[PDB]
Amino acid sequence: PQITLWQRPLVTIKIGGQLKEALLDTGADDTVLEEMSLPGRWKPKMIGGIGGFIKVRQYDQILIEICGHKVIGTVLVGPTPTNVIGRNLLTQIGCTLNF
Amino acid sequence: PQITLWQRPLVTIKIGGQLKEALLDTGADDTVLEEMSLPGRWKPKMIGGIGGFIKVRQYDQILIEICGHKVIGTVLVGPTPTNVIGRNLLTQIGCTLNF
Numbered sequence: 552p553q554i555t556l557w558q559r560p561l562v563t564i565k566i567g568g569q570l571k572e573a574l575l576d577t578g579a580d581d582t583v584l585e586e587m588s589l590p591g592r593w594k595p596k597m598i599g600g601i602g603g604f605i606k607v608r609q610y611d612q613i614l615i616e617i618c619g620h621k622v623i624g625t626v627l628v629g630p631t632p633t634n635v636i637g638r639n640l641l642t643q644i645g646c647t648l649n650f
Numbered sequence: 651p652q653i654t655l656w657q658r659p660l661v662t663i664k665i666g667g668q669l670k671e672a673l674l675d676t677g678a679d680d681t682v683l684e685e686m687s688l689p690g691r692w693k694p695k696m697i698g699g700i701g702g703f704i705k706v707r708q709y710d711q712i713l714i715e716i717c718g719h720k721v722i723g724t725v726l727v728g729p730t731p732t733n734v735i736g737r738n739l740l741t742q743i744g745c746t747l748n749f
């Protein structure tokens with residue numbers, strides 16, 4: 552649908568059998584979720600943002616359902632304040648910015 | 651216009667007589683620009699993101715031109731890696747997310 556930005560653009564996602572709330576973030580190349588019990592294999596990685604760098608576990612080919620659209624992609628899990636849905640998944644649901 | 655997210659959503663902004671490139675960020679409540687000389691007064695503030703917290707100077711009623719749309723709002727200046735245009739200005743140009 553069309554979401555305006557007067558409030559934070561939060562959506563419901565279903566990942567790993569669990570329901571969560573996530574922020575649609577055009578300024579994030581990657582999708583980062585707060586600590587979570589994910590299954591499968593992974594590899595370490597570091598990401599940066601406004602205040603510095605954090606270490607996250609990187610899981611590939613993870614099924615995630617965002618506002619009803621299923622997509623499969625990489626998800627990073629670590630000590631992030633909020634769950635963020637980045638461009639790697641946003642392109643997958645054909646999300647665009649319009650003005 | 652309509653901007654897809656296969657690449658980072660960077661735009662040209664004009665602020666303080668200077669031209670810069672900034673990232674349209676739906677996941678940022680605020681607009682943060684790298685170090686730059688701005689006129690007018692200000693007050694200290696701290697902001698957080700993935701990574702931690704940074705200190706920025708906060709200037710109000712600043713004219714900024716984003717892809718041709720002039721808007722007046724608060725701008726925060728400090729040690730951010732990239733220039734980020736947050737929701738405080740994005741609502742001003744009537745920017746929406748669509749999918």
Ligand SMILES: CC(C)(C)OC(=O)N[C@H](CCN[C@@H](Cc1ccccc1)C(=O)N[C@@H](CCC(=O)O)C(=O)N[C@@H](Cc1ccccc1)C(N)=O)Cc1ccccc1
Nearest residue numbers: 578579580581598599600601677678680697698699731732
């Ligand atoms: C700028 C202010 C006003 C402080 O807001 C946020 O940080 N907002 C966060 C959105 C994040 N948007 C961008 C802003 C940005 C962009 C470039 C540079 C610095 C900052 C971001 O950090 N994006 C990260 C998200 C994590 C990720 O994508 O993996 C990113 O794309 N980082 C890249 C680019 C990068 C590399 C090195 C250093 C810094 C950044 C990366 N691959 O690590 C959301 C949030 C909500 C609640 C609490 C805290 C934070």
